Coordinates of N, CA and C in Angstrom, one line a residue:
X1 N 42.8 15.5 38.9 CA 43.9 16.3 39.4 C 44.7 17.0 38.3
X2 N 45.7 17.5 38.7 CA 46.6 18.5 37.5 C 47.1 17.2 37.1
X3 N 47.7 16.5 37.1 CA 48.6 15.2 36.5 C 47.5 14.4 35.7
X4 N 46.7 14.7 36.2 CA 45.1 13.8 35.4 C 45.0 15.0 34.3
X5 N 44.8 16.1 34.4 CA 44.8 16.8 33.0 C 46.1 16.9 32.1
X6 N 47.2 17.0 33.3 CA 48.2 16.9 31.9 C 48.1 15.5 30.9
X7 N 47.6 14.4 31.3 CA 47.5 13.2 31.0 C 46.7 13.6 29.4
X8 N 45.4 13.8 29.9 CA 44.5 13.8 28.9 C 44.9 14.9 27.8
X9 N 45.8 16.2 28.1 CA 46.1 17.4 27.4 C 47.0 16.4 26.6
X10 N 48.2 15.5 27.1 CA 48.9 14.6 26.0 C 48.3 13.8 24.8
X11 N 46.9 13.5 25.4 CA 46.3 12.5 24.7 C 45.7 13.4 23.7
X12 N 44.8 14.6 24.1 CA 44.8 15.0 22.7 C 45.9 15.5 21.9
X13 N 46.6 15.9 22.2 CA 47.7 16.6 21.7 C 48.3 15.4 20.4
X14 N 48.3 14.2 20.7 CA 48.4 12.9 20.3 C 47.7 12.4 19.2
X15 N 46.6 12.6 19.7 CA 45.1 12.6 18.7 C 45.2 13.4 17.3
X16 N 45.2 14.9 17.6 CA 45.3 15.5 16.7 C 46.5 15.6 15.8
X17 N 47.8 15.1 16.4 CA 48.5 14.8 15.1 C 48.5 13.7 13.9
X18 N 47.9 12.7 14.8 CA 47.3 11.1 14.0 C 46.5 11.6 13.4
X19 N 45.2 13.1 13.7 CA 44.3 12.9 12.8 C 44.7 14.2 11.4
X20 N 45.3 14.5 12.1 CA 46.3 15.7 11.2 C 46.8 14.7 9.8
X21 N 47.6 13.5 9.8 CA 48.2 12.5 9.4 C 47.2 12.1 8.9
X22 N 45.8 11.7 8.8 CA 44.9 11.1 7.9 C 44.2 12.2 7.1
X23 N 44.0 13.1 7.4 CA 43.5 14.3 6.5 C 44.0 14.9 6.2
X24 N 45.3 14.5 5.9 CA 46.4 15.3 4.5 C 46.7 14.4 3.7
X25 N 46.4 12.7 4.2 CA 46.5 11.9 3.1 C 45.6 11.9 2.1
X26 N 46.0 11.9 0.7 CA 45.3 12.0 -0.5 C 43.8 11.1 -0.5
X27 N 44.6 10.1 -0.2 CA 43.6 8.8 -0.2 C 42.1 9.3 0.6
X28 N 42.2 10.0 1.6 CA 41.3 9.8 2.7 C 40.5 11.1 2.6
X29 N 40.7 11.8 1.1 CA 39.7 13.5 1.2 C 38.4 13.3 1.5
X30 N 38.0 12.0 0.8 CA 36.3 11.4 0.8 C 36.2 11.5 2.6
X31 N 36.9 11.3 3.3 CA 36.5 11.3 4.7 C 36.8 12.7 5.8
X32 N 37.4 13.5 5.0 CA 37.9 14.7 5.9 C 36.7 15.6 6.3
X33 N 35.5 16.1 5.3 CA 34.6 16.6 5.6 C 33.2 15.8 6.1
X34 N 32.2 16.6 6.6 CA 30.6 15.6 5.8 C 30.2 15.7 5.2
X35 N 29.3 14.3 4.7 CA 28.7 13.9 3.3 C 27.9 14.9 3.0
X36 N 28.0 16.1 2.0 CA 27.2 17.0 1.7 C 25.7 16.4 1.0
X37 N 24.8 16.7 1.9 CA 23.0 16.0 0.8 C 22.8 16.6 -0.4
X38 N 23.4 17.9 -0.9 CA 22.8 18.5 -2.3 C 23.8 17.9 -2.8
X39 N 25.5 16.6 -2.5 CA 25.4 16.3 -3.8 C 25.3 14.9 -3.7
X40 N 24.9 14.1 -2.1 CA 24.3 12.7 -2.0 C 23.2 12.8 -1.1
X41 N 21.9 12.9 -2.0 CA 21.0 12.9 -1.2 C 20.6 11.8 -0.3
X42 N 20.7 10.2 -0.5 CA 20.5 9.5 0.1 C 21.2 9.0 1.4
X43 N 22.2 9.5 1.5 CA 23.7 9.3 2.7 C 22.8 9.6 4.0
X44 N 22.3 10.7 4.0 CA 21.7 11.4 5.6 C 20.6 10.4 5.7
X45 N 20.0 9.7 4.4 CA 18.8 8.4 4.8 C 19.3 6.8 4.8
X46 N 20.7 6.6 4.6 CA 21.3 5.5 5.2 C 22.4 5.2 6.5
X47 N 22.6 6.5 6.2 CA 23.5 6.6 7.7 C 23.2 7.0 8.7
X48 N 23.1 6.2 10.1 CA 22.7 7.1 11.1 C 23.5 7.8 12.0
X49 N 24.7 7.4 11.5 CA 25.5 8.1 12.8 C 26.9 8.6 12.0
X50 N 26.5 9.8 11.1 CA 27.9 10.3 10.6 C 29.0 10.5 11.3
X51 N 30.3 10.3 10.9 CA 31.7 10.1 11.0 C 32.5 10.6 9.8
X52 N 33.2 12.0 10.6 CA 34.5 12.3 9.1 C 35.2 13.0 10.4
X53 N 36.5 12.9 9.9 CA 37.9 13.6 10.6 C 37.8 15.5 10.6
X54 N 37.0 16.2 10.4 CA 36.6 17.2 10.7 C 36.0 17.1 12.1
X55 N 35.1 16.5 11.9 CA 34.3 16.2 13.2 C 35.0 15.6 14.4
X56 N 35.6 14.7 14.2 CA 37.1 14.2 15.2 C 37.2 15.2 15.2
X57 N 38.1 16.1 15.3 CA 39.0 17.2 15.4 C 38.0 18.0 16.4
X58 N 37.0 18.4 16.3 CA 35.7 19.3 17.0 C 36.0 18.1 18.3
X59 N 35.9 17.2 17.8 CA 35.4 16.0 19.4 C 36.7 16.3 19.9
X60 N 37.9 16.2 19.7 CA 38.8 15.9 20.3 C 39.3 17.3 21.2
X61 N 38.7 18.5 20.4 CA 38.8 19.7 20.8 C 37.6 20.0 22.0
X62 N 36.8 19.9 22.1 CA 35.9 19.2 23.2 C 36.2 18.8 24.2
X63 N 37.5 17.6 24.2 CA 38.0 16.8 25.4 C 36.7 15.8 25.2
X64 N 36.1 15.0 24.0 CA 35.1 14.0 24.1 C 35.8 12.5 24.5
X65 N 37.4 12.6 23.8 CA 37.8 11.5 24.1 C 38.6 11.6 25.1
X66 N 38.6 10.6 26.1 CA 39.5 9.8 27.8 C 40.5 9.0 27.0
X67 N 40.2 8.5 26.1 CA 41.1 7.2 25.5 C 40.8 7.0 24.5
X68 N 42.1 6.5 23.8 CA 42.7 6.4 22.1 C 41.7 5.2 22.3
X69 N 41.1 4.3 22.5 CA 39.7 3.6 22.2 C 38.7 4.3 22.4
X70 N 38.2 5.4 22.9 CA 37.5 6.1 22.6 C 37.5 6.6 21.4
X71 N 38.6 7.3 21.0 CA 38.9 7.7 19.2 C 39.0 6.8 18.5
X72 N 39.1 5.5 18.5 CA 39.3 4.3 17.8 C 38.2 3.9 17.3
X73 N 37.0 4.5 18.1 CA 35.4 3.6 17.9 C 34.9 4.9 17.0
X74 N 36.0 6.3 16.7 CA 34.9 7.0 16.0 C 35.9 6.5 14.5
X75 N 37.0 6.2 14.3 CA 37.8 6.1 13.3 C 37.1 4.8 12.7
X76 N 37.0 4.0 13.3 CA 36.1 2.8 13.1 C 34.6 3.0 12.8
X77 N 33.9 4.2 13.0 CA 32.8 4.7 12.4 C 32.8 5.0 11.6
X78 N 33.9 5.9 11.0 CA 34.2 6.3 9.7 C 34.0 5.3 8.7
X79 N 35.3 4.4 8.9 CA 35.0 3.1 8.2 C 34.2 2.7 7.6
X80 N 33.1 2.2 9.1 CA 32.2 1.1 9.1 C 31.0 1.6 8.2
X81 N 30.8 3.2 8.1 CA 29.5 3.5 7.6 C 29.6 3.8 6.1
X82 N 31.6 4.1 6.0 CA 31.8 3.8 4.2 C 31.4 2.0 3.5
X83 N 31.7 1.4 4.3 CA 31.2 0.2 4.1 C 30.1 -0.5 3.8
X84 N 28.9 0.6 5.1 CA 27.9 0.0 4.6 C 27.1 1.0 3.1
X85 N 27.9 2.2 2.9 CA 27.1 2.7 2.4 C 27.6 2.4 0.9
X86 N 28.8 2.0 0.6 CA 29.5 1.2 -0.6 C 29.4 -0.1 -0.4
X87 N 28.1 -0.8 -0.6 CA 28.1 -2.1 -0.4 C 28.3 -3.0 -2.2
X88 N 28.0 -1.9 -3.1 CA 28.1 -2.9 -4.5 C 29.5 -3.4 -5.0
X89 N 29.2 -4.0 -5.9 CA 30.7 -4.4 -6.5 C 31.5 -3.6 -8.0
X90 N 30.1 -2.3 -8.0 CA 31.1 -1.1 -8.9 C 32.3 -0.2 -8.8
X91 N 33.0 -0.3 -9.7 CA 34.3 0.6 -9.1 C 34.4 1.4 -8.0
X92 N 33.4 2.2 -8.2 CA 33.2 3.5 -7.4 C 33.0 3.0 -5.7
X93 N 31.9 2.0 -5.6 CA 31.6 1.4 -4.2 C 33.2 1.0 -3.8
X94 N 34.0 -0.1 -4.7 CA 35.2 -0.8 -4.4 C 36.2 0.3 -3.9
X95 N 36.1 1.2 -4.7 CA 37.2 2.5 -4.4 C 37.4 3.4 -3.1
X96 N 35.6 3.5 -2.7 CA 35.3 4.0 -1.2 C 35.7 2.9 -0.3
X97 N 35.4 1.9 -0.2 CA 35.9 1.0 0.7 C 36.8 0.6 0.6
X98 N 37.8 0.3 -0.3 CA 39.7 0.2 -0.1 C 39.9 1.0 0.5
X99 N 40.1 2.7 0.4 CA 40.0 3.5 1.6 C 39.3 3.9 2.3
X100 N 38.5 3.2 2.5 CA 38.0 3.2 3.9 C 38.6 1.8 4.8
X101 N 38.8 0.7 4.6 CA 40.0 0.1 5.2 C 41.4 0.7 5.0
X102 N 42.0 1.2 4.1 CA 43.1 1.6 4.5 C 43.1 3.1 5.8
X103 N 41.9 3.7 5.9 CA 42.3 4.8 6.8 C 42.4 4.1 8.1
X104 N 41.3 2.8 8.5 CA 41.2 2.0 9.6 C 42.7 1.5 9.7
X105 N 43.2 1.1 8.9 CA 44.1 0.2 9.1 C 45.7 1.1 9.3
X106 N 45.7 2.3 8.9 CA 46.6 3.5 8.8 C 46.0 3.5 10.2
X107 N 45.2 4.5 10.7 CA 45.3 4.4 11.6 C 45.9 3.6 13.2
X108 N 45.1 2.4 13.2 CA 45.4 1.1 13.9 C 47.3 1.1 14.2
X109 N 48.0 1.5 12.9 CA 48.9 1.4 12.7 C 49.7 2.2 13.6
X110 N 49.8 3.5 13.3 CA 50.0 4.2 13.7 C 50.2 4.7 15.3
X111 N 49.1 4.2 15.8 CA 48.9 4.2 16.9 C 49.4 2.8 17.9
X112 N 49.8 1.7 17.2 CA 50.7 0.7 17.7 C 51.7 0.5 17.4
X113 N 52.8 1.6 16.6 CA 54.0 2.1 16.5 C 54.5 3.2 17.3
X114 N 53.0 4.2 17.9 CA 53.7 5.6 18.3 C 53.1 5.7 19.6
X115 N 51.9 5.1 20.0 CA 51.4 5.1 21.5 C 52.0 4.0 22.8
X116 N 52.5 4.5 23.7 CA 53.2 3.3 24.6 C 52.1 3.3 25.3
X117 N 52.0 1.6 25.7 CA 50.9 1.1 26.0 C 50.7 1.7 27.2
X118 N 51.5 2.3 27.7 CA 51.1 2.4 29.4 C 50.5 3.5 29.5
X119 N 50.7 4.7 28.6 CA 49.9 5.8 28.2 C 48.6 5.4 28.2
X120 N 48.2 4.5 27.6 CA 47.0 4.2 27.2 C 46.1 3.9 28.3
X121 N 47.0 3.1 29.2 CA 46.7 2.3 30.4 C 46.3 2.9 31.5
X122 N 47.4 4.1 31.7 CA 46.7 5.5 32.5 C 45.4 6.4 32.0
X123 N 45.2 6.0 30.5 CA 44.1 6.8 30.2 C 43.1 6.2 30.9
X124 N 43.2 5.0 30.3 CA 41.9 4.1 30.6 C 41.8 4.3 32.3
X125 N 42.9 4.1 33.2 CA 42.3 3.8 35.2 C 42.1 5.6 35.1
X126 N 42.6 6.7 34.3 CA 41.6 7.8 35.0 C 40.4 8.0 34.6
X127 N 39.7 7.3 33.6 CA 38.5 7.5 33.1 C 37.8 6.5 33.9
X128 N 38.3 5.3 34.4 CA 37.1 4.3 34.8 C 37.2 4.9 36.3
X129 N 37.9 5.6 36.8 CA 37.4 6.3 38.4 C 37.0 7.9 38.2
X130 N 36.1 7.7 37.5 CA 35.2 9.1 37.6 C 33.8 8.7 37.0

């Protein structure tokens, strides 16, 4: 219905300022674009399922996400694939993964200071009746 789109029009509207907020933090540049192969060739042969906040922004613009758990599981992709792909104990690995938990955790934050849960609540019962 119209009240079911304004719903979702809020949710992104929502989305894109939270993700606006991570890709102008300094910390988080390694994640705003994707991993270019001419200057990590191995990334596109360890990762199967790229994640950067450029690409959020396309999804969100899309209308791919019903619910901030839906955006949560790609923010959480981000993360998880800096993680696995910085798995040593050299600076450089240490450095990608501090932020890459701090963007998870900036986020998380964020979004359980500024989203009222009932928002969320209505996202979730119009997505699970369609």
């Amino acid at each position: 219905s119209m009240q079911e789109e304004d719903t979702f029009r809020e949710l992104r509207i929502f989305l894109r300022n939270v993700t606006h907020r991570l890709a102008i933090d300094k910390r988080f540049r390694v994640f705003t674009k994707p991993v270019d192969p001419d200057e990590v060739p191995d990334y596109v042969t360890v990762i199967k399922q790229p994640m950067d906040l450029s690409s959020v922004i396309s999804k969100i613009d899309l209308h791919k996400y019903l619910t901030v758990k839906d955006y949560l599981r790609d923010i959480d992709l981000i993360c998880s694939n800096a993680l696995e792909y910085n798995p040593d104990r050299d600076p450089g690995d240490r450095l990608i993964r501090h932020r890459a938990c701090a963007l998870r955790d900036t986020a998380y934050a964020i979004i359980k200071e500024e989203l009222d849960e009932d928002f969320e609540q209505l996202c979730e019962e119009i997505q699970e009746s369609r």
